[PDB]
Design a protein around this ligand. Structure first.
Ligand SMILES: NC(=O)N[C@@H](CC(=O)O)C(=O)O
Ligand SMILES: NC(=O)N[C@@H](CC(=O)O)C(=O)O
Ligand SMILES: [Zn+2]
Ligand SMILES: [Zn+2]
Ligand SMILES: [Zn+2]
Ligand SMILES: [Zn+2]
Ligand SMILES: [Zn+2]
Ligand SMILES: [Zn+2]
Ligand SMILES: [Zn+2]
Ligand SMILES: [Zn+2]
Lengths: 364, 364
């Protein structure tokens, strides 16, 4: 007996095209998405070239339209030079991404004044998301209040961060957040097994107490999002390992295992992988789109999942219960039992759909 | 023709007693204060032992009462263990100091939740000051808003920081700040002369653009305070130089030079070294207390000032115009032309004066 889910949405993926296509490209990354029960992804802008201007966005749009197998929206990235220049293309993007700490990213800003300039100039009705760790969460929340708008915090990983967000929500502040599966299912306890290179990720893996705090504060978590951050094994195991884990193919199986164990409900999962992503990012429905999962199937995560070019996974050896059996995307069979059945280019930019534009008031 | 000033107040000094008395002690540091035209100082808690509990405060009070030559108040320091424990002694302190970044300090906190706990537990009517650099300024402002109270930002040193505070004030937020003389009168341009050890200070010396921004935004600066941070030349020039500059003896001459050049007015100076310190920290008046200065005397800062045990100065070689000629403290001549004339122990804890208690509403 399969369970039918709606088309799940991952609002934080790195698909590496343009410029990093040995790690992943639109075709491989969206195959990984479909195999993970994900029918829509929002791709981050830290590519090469980074998506920080209109010409780079135009290129990325075409590469995505040609390569994507599932539907998508593309983020713009904030830079030290582009505040006040993105107005004509802003509405065509998923939102604006701010990189406020050291990580795999033309995009760390050097001053909080630059953050303020982005919050002041980016259209007020469009999403802003931030990589903001530890005190940076409080800092960016202050900037959002000064500029009287909302902000979404990416990959929350620590007790400190979730409790700060909880306190902000208790004061009625417009903040939402997401959590990635590695911060729910891995911790410091796993670093011995992973080793120092594979274990590199930002935010770093947390203590058992961090992980426990995220679970205890599930009510504070608006979305799950993979932060699918593919790098090859050679890169992860080499002399300057880049941070990040692949995660599209493992996210849903990990979370279904948790549902089966009663750690959260099916509804809790679907709020966080479907309804809240839609409402925070104003992402449109996908007609005749659904995912069929088998909740009874027990399996062990192998040393690499079939689709991501990363060709490794930090979840190797974990026992999971739950598998994606079939995905239908806009009336076509997209995935069955390990086979992707839609070609590169089947996917579409949801921001071009009439229903995918973010509503806004008319010029004065 | 001498100009009579009121008794000036320095709300940020490190007097090193207990535990660092080769660098300074209450007697030498307050001699330095008097020679700099300062009749009241607020001493920071990063001593050895640090002033983070009632017994340490009791010790420091007695050492100060016995050694101080000018009047004083003593800060308590926030630690990772003392939130909720300082209520009985809080009103006897200058205020609570939070160390939120790496510097010469049992006192960096590890989580913003610890900051929140201090803001929630410290009595709401008493001062809180923070060492908070760059984005940390925005973060601590967020914590202050979440807990609906004020905060004072120590030694603002950067364009980024003063502009953030300016934006907060424009939104009516209860934030005040101070600036130290080295951030007004030294910059990166001076690092070649100072060298890497002597030049170590937190916040670090800024660019010419940082310095220019502080001057341009003088209206945003509530107080001047030295951050007198004495260390010996051996320590500054050794293999692990501690950050900090001595500054009590040079602050007023530097600022008087600026007044003489029309960079700020005498009133601007007195707001920042007298009236605003009084009102932010609820420091009492000092009866029959004044400072006589000679505004015409030109001199060059020597390699060390006479009183601080630091026995060096980063302002060596700067030409100044303005000198402290006489200080009268509570009806006694305390300083004349290079001679301190009040003994260790003349100074008093202003928080013990009836007029030095911070006003508060009665228990419910
Ligand atoms: N999270 C990571 O460790 N890496 C991400 C970047 C990011 O989300 O910050 C990547 O693009 O590789
Ligand atoms: N400012 C410094 O560089 N050092 C100060 C500490 C401080 O004010 O942070 C000290 O106590 O030495
Ligand atoms: Zn990130
Ligand atoms: Zn994100
Ligand atoms: Zn990311
Ligand atoms: Zn909507
Ligand atoms: Zn400091
Ligand atoms: Zn201070
Ligand atoms: Zn200090
Ligand atoms: Zn008062």
């Amino acid at each position: 007996k399969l369970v039918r889910l709606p088309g799940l949405i991952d609002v934080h993926v790195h698909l590496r095209e343009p410029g990093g296509t040995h790690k992943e490209d639109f075709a491989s990354g969206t195959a990984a998405a479909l195999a993970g029960g994900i029918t829509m992804v929002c791709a981050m802008p830290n590519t090469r070239p980074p998506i920080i201007d209109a010409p780079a966005l135009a290129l990325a749009q075409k590469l995505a339209e040609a390569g994507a197998r599932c539907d998508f929206a593309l983020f713009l990235g904030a830079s030290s030079e582009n505040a006040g220049t993105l107005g004509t293309v802003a509405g065509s993007a998923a939102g604006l991404k701010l990189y406020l700490n050291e990580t795999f990213s033309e995009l760390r800003l050097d001053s909080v004044v630059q953050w303020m300039e982005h919050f002041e100039t980016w259209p007020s009705h469009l999403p802003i998301v931030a990589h903001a760790e530890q005190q940076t969460v409080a800092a960016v929340l202050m900037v959002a209040q000064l500029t009287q708008r909302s902000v979404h915090i990416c990959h929350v990983a620590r007790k400190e961060e979730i409790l700060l967000i909880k306190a902000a929500k208790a004061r009625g502040l417009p903040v939402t957040c997401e959590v990635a599966p590695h911060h729910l299912f891995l911790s410091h306890d796993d670093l011995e097994r992973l080793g120092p290179g594979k274990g590199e990720v930002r935010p770093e893996l947390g203590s058992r107490q961090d992980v426990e705090a995220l679970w205890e504060n599930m009510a504070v978590i608006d979305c799950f999002a993979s932060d699918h951050a593919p790098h090859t094994l050679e890169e992860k195991c080499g002399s300057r390992p880049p941070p990040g884990f692949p995660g599209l193919e493992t996210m849903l199986p990990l979370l279904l295992t948790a549902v089966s164990e009663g750690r959260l409900s099916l509804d809790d999962l679907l709020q966080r992988l479907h309804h809240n992503p839609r409402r925070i990012f104003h992402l449109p429905p996908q007609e005749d789109t659904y995912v069929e999962v088998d909740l009874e199937h027990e399996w062990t995560i192998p040393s690499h999942m079939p689709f991501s070019k990363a060709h490794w996974t930090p979840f190797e050896g974990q026992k999971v219960k739950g598998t994606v059996r079939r995905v239908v995307l806009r009336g076509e069979v997209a995935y069955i039992d390990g086979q992707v059945l839609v070609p590169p280019g089947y996917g579409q930019d949801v921001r071009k759909w009439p229903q995918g534009a973010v509503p806004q008031l008319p010029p004065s």
